Structures are given as structure tokens and as C-alpha cells.
Enzyme design. Structure first.
Site, PDB file in Angstrom:
ATOM      1  N   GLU A   7       0.641  -1.285  -0.151  1.00  0.00           N
ATOM      2  CA  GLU A   7       0.141   0.301  -0.121  1.00  0.00           C
ATOM      3  C   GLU A   7       0.844   1.076   0.089  1.00  0.00           C
ATOM      4  OE1 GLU A   7      -4.009  -1.700   1.737  1.00  0.00           O
ATOM      5  OE2 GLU A   7      -2.857  -0.339   3.380  1.00  0.00           O
ATOM      6  N   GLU A   9      -5.746  -7.456  -1.534  1.00  0.00           N
ATOM      7  CA  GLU A   9      -6.215  -7.168  -0.208  1.00  0.00           C
ATOM      8  C   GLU A   9      -7.649  -6.408  -0.089  1.00  0.00           C
ATOM      9  OE1 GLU A   9      -3.436  -5.818   2.988  1.00  0.00           O
ATOM     10  OE2 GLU A   9      -5.129  -4.618   3.200  1.00  0.00           O
TER      11      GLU A   9
END
Length: 357
Positions: A151, A263
């Protein structure tokens, strides 16, 4: 179950590739037919590494029907940078995935800080070089999928964060391109590349993609925070207007790149709140219809809603052991509301939740 044709095991599907299906790029196996991977992500291997065990991987592959698993190796937050031993679990996880027929995502879990170029992440190139080198020759090397930066985000905890725009994407691309190139020298394995605002921006990647083969771009969503959308952006919409995560996925696909939901969670972005199941049905039906592979967060017994296993709750529930034991099945009441739901959706069975009293 029915409608599970594309969720093939690596022994069947073989080496992964991207094919153009209906003007968009999609994941496919060796024979060129579309393949979708469904599975679970570990939580941080430095906190919940106990999940990497024989019985657990057998349960997840067979009882849950997963054809993939994701190994989240944090680098900051007491992960790999300070505690190198966590890499041992990446190797063990790969070995078990190989043995138990699941594709395995090796995830360099960029998180705090959000800029993947930050100093704490200096070992990224050498980490991927090392794992790739070890497995190059293995007959099952094609089971590995590389995820270079979980991320990218504005998170400034432990180093610089990134902006939600072209400059932020160019920073990720700058980080990724030398590692992509080295990985391509060692093999053809799929590389999944994160992008700004906690990998909510595959659209920025579509506007300026890495020029290499078998690169897919991440999307991350939590059904308690990222609302579904059916209206895609008007043609010509500038990037500044693109804030809806579902519409950003549609943009990436319509504009020539492949996406992988590495995710997602049933809670709000944090890993708590809800669960938000009716929303999760809309998001997973969207993913499934468009052949986008997905990994759910996460295999933990921590008391947070996204966690798949029942936590310790003083009154009455002990935390579920991350090793399910010899029967290699976790009982229904040992999975949380979220774990029970996600198991059903990975398996493609009807969601028939137990009465929790």
C-alpha cells in the site's frame, strides 16, 4: 460448487499470463483460458506467523477451497528491517503452498511509511533477488507471484508518505522498475504493483503503465468504507476526479491494464467496524464477474472484525488456534463472522451462517 470453473489449482492452470479478453487484459493460465485466484492473506508475519503451518495450509487449500494464499511480510513496524527472521516464514509458506497446490503471493508489505522508496525499505531489491534466485529452477517456480509494494499511501509513520496523484504513481513506478527488470531476468512470474492512496489507484497505473510483461496493478477495498458504484467515469475524466475505488477498477480495465485485488476486508479500512456483508456481496460479484482475483485480510485471531478467527473474549471464547490440528478443518464457531463468510465466498458455496446464540 457451480460457477467455479475458473478458480483452478496451479497444478492444473500452470504458468500465469495476461490475455486480452473482450478488449481488456485478464489473468489466464497456460492454455490461455481465464483463471481467478481466491484466497486469504496472512496478517503481519511478525505478529501472526503461527498461521504458516502444515494443517492450516491444508485446511485453507482443501476445506476453504483456496487456490492461492498471500504472505504479508511487513518491513517496518518490527518486521523485516529490524527482525530479519520473519523472511524464514516466507520460505516456509512458499514450501507449503507448493506442496498444497496454491499459488503464493510474496508480499513486500509497504505500509508504514507509505512511500516504497523510503530508507527502511532499502532491502527490497535484494529481498526479491534472493527469493527469486532460490526458486528460479524449481519445477513449481511458476506458483510464486511477486507483490512489490502492498500500500503506497500518505502514511508518514517511519519515513515519507506519497501523494494521491501522478507524482505519487511516478514514485511507485520509479521504485518498481529496477526490481521488475531484475525479476524478469530470473523469470516470467506475475508481478503485482500497488499504487497511491492505499492501492486504490490502478487507474493512475493505467495512464502510465510499467512497460513490461505480466504486470498487474493492485486494488484494495474495505466494504465498510469503499462504496460500490455502477457508473464508470465519463470518457476524458481527469485523474483528479477519480476517487471511487470501484470506478477506478473499471477505469483501469477499460484503459488497458489488468488488476488484482491483493487485499480487501469486510470491515472499514482500519480492519474493524461491521462486518459489511451485503456490500461485500456487491463487491465480490463485481470482482468475480470481471475475473479479478482477490485475497481477503486476514488470517488472524486478533480481536478486530476483519480477522478470520474467533478472538479471546473473556466472557466466553478463547482465541482459535491458528493450527487447526490433525482434522485440518476449523470448526464453524472457531471462525469469526468475517472468516465464516469469506470461507463460503472462496469456496463458492451458499452463505449459511451459524446461529451465534
Amino acid at each position: 460448487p457451480a460457477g467455479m470453473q475458473a478458480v483452478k489449482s496451479p497444478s492444473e492452470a500452470g504458468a500465469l499470463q495476461l490475455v486480452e479478453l473482450n478488449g481488456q487484459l485478464t489473468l489466464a493460465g497456460e492454455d490461455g483460458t481465464p483463471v481467478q485466484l481466491r484466497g486469504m492473506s496472512t496478517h503481519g508475519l511478525q505478529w501472526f506467523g503461527e498461521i504458516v503451518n502444515e494443517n492450516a495450509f491444508v485446511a485453507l487449500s482443501n476445506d476453504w477451497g483456496s487456490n492461492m494464499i498471500r504472505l504479508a511480510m511487513y518491513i517496518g513496524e518490527n518486521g523485516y528491517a529490524t527482525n530479519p527472521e520473519v523472511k524464514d516464514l516466507v520460505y516456509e509458506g512458499i514450501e507449503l503452498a507448493f506442496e498444497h497446490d496454491m499459488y503464493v503471493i510474496v508480499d513486500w508489505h509497504v505500509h508504514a511509511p507509505g512511500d516504497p522508496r523510503a530508507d527502511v525499505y532499502s532491502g527490497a531489491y535484494d529481498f526479491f533477488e534472493e527469493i527469486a534466485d532460490h526458486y528460479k529452477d524449481h519445477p513449481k517456480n511458476h506458483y510464486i507471484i511477486w507483490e512489490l509494494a502492498n500500500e503506497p499511501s500518505p502514511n508518514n509513520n517511519g519515513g515519507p508518505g506519497l501523494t494521491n496523484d501522478e507524482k505519487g504513481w511516478e514514485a511507485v513506478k520509479e521504485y518498481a522498475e529496477p526490481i521488475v527488470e531484475m525479476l524478469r531476468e530470473k523469470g516470467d512470474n506475475m508481478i503485482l504493483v500497488g499504487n497511491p492512496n492505499w492501492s486504490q489507484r490502478p487507474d493512475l497505473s493505467a495512464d502510465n503503465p510499467i512497460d513490461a510483461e505480466n504486470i498487474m496493478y493492485s486494488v484494495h477495498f474495505y466494504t465498510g468504507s469503499h462504496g460500490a458504484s455502477h457508473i464508470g467515469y465519463p470518457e476524458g475524466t481527469p485523474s483528479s476526479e477519480r476517487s471511487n475505488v470501484m470506478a477506478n477498477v473499471r477505469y483501469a480495465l477499460d484503459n488497458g491494464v489488468a488488476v488484482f485485488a491483493t487485499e480487501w476486508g469486510t470491515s472499514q479500512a482500519n480492519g474493524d467496524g461491521g462486518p459489511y456483508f451485503d456490500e461485500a456481496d456487491v463487491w465480490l460479484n463485481f470482482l468475480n464477474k470481471h475475473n479479478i482475483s482477490w485475497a481477503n485480510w486476514s488470517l488472524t485471531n486478533k480481536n478486530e472484525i476483519s480477522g478470520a478467527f474467533t478472538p479471546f473474549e473473556l466472557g466466553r471464547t478463547d482465541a482459535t488456534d491458528l493450527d487447526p490440528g490433525a482434522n485440518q478443518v476449523w470448526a464453524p464457531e472457531e471462525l469469526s463472522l468475517s472468516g465464516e463468510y469469506v470461507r463460503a465466498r472462496i469456496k463458492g458455496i451458499e452463505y449459511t451462517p451459524i446461529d451465534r446464540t
